[PDB]
């Protein structure tokens, strides 16, 4: 299973580098709500600035990853994300895509997926916030619906607070996420 | 004592494997004169592309 | 692999019972375009009447399937669908659709045998019928995958597929299964936004 192999390897590599990270994306959505066919492995990594993100990427390029794409943005964090390939499956590392990557990593829960496969998995509330922001990639709307259907009242309030923090940090791309959240 | 979240993530891994095999069968149909290596090359290109 | 195991088993069981069936929903879409699916394996079964539907379900209950839900409607075909568990929210499930869209006999008759996985040949609903079913089921609030499956299907569709989708919508509507909606007009409005 190419994805299982990729998850195992990136988990060991990020842990060996003592990084603050969490599984997000379709596999995290599946864990928190309803499983779905997913082929991208998406991981949030909390680092302080572009220099630190670049340093992590440079190290991973010496461990048999290659750079497929980088997502640049006109902001203080010029590096939102990178897309890396195995030299199996794509891994996206998200550094400054939603602006709450530190909170996502800090709140993520370690799950033993299979023997010798342990990964921090983002909370339902943080996935709701990410998927609300990213809404566009039509699978985000479906992931969001599933997450909301699974969410507890407390998950809903926690998502509200995460979305407020995205906006306070200027990562809301000029949208009224609070209004959008009232509708979900 | 596998957690519910872990059970759901293990199911999603099974879903990926099925989807990969379905993509492989479809590519074989769409490209009947393609050799195994060409199909696997197409499968590898497939993962690398964004959603 | 629990997904593969269930697909192979339900295909073998329905074919062994000589049913007129077709894979629909995400797994059918995934045989014809980029994979997109959830734990629900959706299958149309064309049966004569509610008695025949119930007799098939009763038979499957003796073959290690468990009934999770029945969908009923105020119509002459009272039993629209059943939900079967194949095991004991991380479970693959089978939805059998008997009278959900009203063109189940046509769907099964037009279905194409496709080797969807190695040595797994199953009747797969045509792209045209998948379009018609997705338009009807479409609920952008609760089922956004229906609208995204729609974009993918219409892009995968040949001219024949488009013509046959229009004909399928017309037959759904003639039979009164269109839920008081203009599916063709909905399609036009959605496809303008493509």
Numbering used by the authors:
A (entry chain B): 2 to 88, 94 to 142, 146 to 193
B (entry chain C): 2 to 52
C (entry chain A): 2 to 89, 92 to 197
Can you provide the manuscript's text about this entry?
Members of the MenAT family of TA systems in M. tuberculosis encode a toxin with a conserved nucleotidyltransferase (NTase)-like protein domain (DUF1814) and a cognate antitoxin, which can belong to different protein families. We show that MenAT1 can function as a bona fide TA system in vivo in its native host M. tuberculosis. Furthermore, the toxin MenT1 acts as a tRNA NTase in vitro, which transfers CMPs to the 3ʹ end of tRNA acceptor stems without preference for specific tRNAs. MenT1 biochemical activity was fully inhibited by purified MenA1.
We subsequently determined the X-ray crystallographic structure of the MenAT1 complex, to a resolution of 1.44 Å. The MenAT1 crystal structure features two MenT1 protomers (MenT1α and MenT1β) bound to a MenA1 antitoxin monomer to form a MenT1α:MenA1:MenT1β complex. The MenA1 antitoxin protein consists of a long central helix (α1) linked by a flexible loop to a shorter C-terminal helix (α2). The α2 helix folds back, partially towards the α1 helix, yet angled outwards, forming an asymmetrical, twisted “V” shape. Within the complex structure, the resolved MenA1 antitoxin binds asymmetrically, running in opposing directions across the same face of each MenT1 protomer. This brings the electropositive cavities of each MenT1 protomer into juxtaposition, suggesting that MenA1 prevents MenT1 toxicity by blocking the active site. MenA1 residues L14 and V19 bind into pockets lined with L8, L120 and L123 from MenT1α and MenT1β, respectively. A close-up view of the interaction interface reveals that MenT1α F38 is pulled out by the asymmetry of MenA1 binding, allowing formation of a hydrophobic network comprising MenT1α F38, MenT1β F28 and MenT1β F38 stacked underneath MenA1. PDBsum calculated a buried surface area of 895 Å2 between MenA1 and MenT1β, and identified a salt bridge formed between MenA1 R27 and MenT1β E35, supported by hydrogen bonding with MenA1 W47. As such, MenAT1 appears to form a novel complex that is suggested to both sequester and block MenT1 toxins using asymmetric antitoxin binding.
